[PDB]
Design a protein around this ligand. Sequence first.
Ligand SMILES: Nc1ncnc2c1ncn2[C@@H]1O[C@H](COP(=O)(O)OP(=O)(O)OP(=O)(O)O)[C@@H](O)[C@H]1O
Ligand SMILES: [Mg+2]
Lengths: 375, 66, 48, 157
Amino acid sequence: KLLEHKEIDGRLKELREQLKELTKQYEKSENDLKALQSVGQIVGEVLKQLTEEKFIVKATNGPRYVVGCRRQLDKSKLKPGTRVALDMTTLTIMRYLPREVDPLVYNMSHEDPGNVSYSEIGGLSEQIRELREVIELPLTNPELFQRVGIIPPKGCLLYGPPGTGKTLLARAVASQLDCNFLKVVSSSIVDKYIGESARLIREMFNYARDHQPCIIFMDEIDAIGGRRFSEGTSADREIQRTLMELLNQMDGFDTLHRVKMIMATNRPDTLDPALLRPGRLDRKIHIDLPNEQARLDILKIHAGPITKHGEIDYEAIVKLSDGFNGADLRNVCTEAGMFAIRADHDFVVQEDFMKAVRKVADSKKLESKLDYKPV
Amino acid sequence: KRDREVQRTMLELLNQLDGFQPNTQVKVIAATNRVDILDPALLRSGRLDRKIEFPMPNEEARARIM
Amino acid sequence: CTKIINADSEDPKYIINVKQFAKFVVDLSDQVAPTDIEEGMRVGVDRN
Amino acid sequence: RLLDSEIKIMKSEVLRVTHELQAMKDKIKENSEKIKVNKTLPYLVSNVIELLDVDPKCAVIKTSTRQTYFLPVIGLVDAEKLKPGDLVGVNKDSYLILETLPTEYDSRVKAMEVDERPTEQYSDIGGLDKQIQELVEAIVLPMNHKEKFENLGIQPP
Ligand SMILES: Nc1ncnc2c1ncn2[C@@H]1O[C@H](COP(=O)(O)OP(=O)(O)OP(=O)(O)O)[C@@H](O)[C@H]1O
Ligand SMILES: [Mg+2]
């Protein structure tokens, strides 16, 4: 006699499920409707304090408004320069906020470089070891240098010809280390609005200081690091302005606490001597063309995942690979795989690599490795 | 080759070409008549894997052209 | 004008940029057909 | 005896819960209609900034009219659907967020894309079979197959 009992019980349970779903709809509706009647609040930065009921706020890019704290805010928290929200009606402060703004810095922090172990880089053991001495040891174990006495360097620069692994090394450092990491393209930190790039540098340094320990990586620093023109357009004016802003940020009077900084450039010569001065960039790191042994190492790294067939003579490839930058050998592996694709094969043999090396050596004649200069 | 405005745009171009989490699935094709002006790092093997030379048409190639 | 939404295709919604002034999400007056509007299009709008 | 006594309750409960569902649905309809008529359609698009944690669902907005605003509540959009630097359409007066928007990039970039799709076949190119094959296998094969490369393991050019 289970038919009516269990069938109608299932009907009741199904109707209860539909009721809970519909009440979820209603909860969403009433909640967002209650949120609707609210209103936004203007944002601005509290300046000097007159009395315990009178304050001064510059409403961001608006004017400066004399206003008063609402009732509950701890007056101690309303420090000169802190960020607060104001009623759009009475302008009274009703909440202090986390310090500043600029999701640009948010993007430049949450940039994902991917997992790159130091082993994934080849032939740079001295430089890799060198970088960890100025980027990792001070923030991990600051107490060590107290007994050594020597204060840690804050910034150090990577310079070398294109395709030797500078950006790769930076990616590796960002991936493995457990700290706040800022990734900079020196172009995108240069905006057209008057005096906006220097402001952006200031805010990114402030973000680093608030989120200690922090690492700042500025790739292609020569974009703004160029030598200061004596005269020029608004371009020269504001670019040198941003350069001097960054300089004041890292040079001194502020003595950056845990703001260890990294930059890379293909043209260290064009950099202003103010940057290249040792106090800012103490350990200048030259990332040379890989040696024959280093070339074999990186070749082993990038040829690894390839489904090879039979023996592989990396040594002969290294022999024909004269003067190849690191990125070239990755191109060698890619071209060998492409030759295997051409043969329709599902595997790669030594002759594929040999043809690849010849092909990229022919292309090597195009990239005129000029009379290249260091810093 | 490496007025700093064009230089900065070009640098943005190479950093986009290399890219953190490189290239996702975006392939790029470039055409120039004068390689000698490109030089330092745009011709890097990473950013431009394949350099394809276009020679003056061969005699049989010219016949096919016509 | 910019980037017609067209999410429901009935009132497709339009994002415009009143240059020097602001940016907005707006609709059409009933007189102008959606087929009369393309992306950008330098379109003039009412004041209210 | 049995199966004949419970008949009153099992159906009366269903009908009463159905009536409750009808009334609850009516309330939802009223709320939805009021919200919809509330959704005016100027929206004053604006960029999203840090979503600060609540403390006794908070967003900071930079408006297209070059003003910054703090919202005690986001509005009619879920919090995690937002990503600082994102574009949202807000109330033109109260600045509450009621939209999620495509980013948009630039007029130049929209003009940059190809919609005409020209129609030159590889046959019209003559004498370049080496070069045409080179470019095709360099570009189109990752577009179409993507399995040859992963089978070999190489990163495609
Ligand atoms: N030592 C190395 N070990 C492994 N891979 C390397 C090495 N050197 C270069 N590569 C390869 O070449 C590329 C490294 O170039 P990367 O993008 O890091 O910048 P770069 O050529 O040093 O300069 P920039 O990005 O500043 O122009 C990567 O694709 C990486 O796989
Ligand atoms: Mg780089």
